[PDB]
Amino acid sequence: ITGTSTVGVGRGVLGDQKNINTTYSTYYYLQDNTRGDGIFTYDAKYRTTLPGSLWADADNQFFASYDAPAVDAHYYAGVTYDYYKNVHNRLSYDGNNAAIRSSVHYSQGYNNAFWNGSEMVYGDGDGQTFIPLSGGIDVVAHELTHAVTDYTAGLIYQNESGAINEAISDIFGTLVEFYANKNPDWEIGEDVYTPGISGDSLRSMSDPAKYGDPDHYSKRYTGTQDNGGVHINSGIINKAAYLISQGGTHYGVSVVGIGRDKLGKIFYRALTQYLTPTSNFSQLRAAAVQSATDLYGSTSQEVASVKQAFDAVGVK
Template sequence: MADDEAPAVGHGFHSGTVPLTTAYNGETYELKDPTRGNMSGYLDGRNSAGSVESVLFTDTDNEWGDGTKSDKASQAVDAQYAATKAWDYFANVHGRKGFDGEGRALNLHGRIPGVPLPNGRPAYQKERDDRPARITYASPGQERGKDVLYKQVDIATLDLVGGAFAMGIASTEAGLPSLDDTPGHPELEEPYAIGAATADIFGTMVEFYANNRVDRPDYLIGERFTAGFPAGTFNDPVSMAKPSVGCWITKIRTEKGPALHFFYLLAVGSNPTEGEASPTCNGMPVTGIGNDKAAKIWYRALTEYFAEKTDYAAARIATLKAAADLYGAHSLEYNTVNAAWSAVSVSGSNPIPGGQTPYTVNPGDQDAVVKTAVSLQLAATNPGGRPLTYTAVGLPPGLTIDAASGLISGTPTKTGDYRVTVGVTDTLHAQSTTWFMWYVA
């Protein structure tokens, strides 16, 4: 143990009682972690001259905070603990030391009234001439805005602070823009969405890595941040399984929802045995490959293929290449990446030609008469020779499909024009879809 390294106990509002590593300077304990790049916790405020001043948190007995949401030291514990878990997650899972890969820490700065907080949540702030890169978060008592009546407290959660740490990686490694970079630069709107999604994806993975008994892991973003405020103050937390915008469309360029939806489908799937069902945009099922593989694919794409102007189309190609690097071209993992992107309406070319993807044969438009039985056998090419599963979405009421055989049958019960999407998937998750109209008179 280094001379100034001291095991400490912290009492956080979000994290509960947790271990920390601090430093002893010979007179007092400092919220500074010598084992993780001297990562330190500060309180920012305005001094008598009106300028912002950062003061390092110190303590006399090395037991930090009282666990209440009104205590500044307790929130500093939450922030320090979350950043510690983020550091350890990237070091132990991805082999990355510090946010920059070279062992540098992101210090934690709690803001008090009079010092604005960017974006209303813990935020990564780039290095400037007058200060190093850091994470800022709100301290108890800060108002969010002059037209808002609530107080902004208790936001130093595992997923939000972990996400800010990950945004530091996204900015440093790939040059992905932050929100401050996008005004007046529409070409950066989708890259910002990819960066914001990266933050939430890895913030969630940090939450799972920590497996904290108070802030339990889930696929909700900022759920404890939301719960810490008066009822009705905030909208519901973002759900990766069912984000408000879960399908990519060109008119919503700054939305991170499709990327979060993609990751959930890749990791968990559309209809898991455990966890929340996640409807797909194309009606096709997706079977997840697990958090570990999904996160490793996104991390490799981030560090090897993402760039400043990576948009959704480029992110799809990057993650396919990453999956091929890690697990092989046209492997189950590769095919699941492709299926998950298609399931959020992001499609495109195959960056690695070949494979044995089955293709549904389009049966052409169909006519039927209400209350008259029909039967339609779907066909599909199957170059891989693996068992196939058929799906159909949008069938006229009264009709069903046999998933194993692809036979659509039944008796239509309602007249109308129906757009039917049919698809086929093999056991390596390779899949394809096509659509036709079914007119019921």
């Protein structure tokens, strides 16, 4: 919409108050003109037709419970845009400031959120398994990161390349959660998963086996479910990424951590310069080693740690 840029105030899914960038033109819309070609938030009104209508509000105050998921989808797309721009010098997901569109209130009782190749889509959850999924900054950033992967490596969504695609999204969704310093951790989806149980999450990067996902290549799922285990076998890479960052001993192999910042720089380089659509886990190791080499030298501690981490999870 064409109008004046302004700032509104609302409450997110978890009850926190935040300011959001809006546009005024008769109504106040969830349109943030300050980032790239814009961040746009739509109401899918419990239907599955997309994108729905651009979110319009009469007084720029978003404190209704129906507004909550929109507030957070709009705000957390802005934080994810800022992370990629400030940390990695990338302007939006295509690297050329493409507009970011999200629709909330998709369908009824829908326990999922996803990047559909053109925009973000978020369900409200059924209220037991999930609450509205845009309340989870690691969820928003995990899904928005599929857009970057799609424009760069293009990892296909099946077998080992799909599991790498998923792990890359968990890694960067976690780094965005640490960048916003929103109670950060190495778990995924804990702010929006099961409102009635404290302390769990959908997946864990520091210990994938806590929820039954593999944490070593010898425990990888080889059947056909879940497009060959894309959400299951990502635990092997997530554990490798956690060890590169934090360090630790895993199945007797010791890794000296190099921290989150270097973890993000290595994986971002690996993703945008060496991964291809059919890369497998072994090619991922090679790409991460080559990236660390590029950045820190072939005889650095950083290359040594990337090697130890992949060795610890059985990827050669």
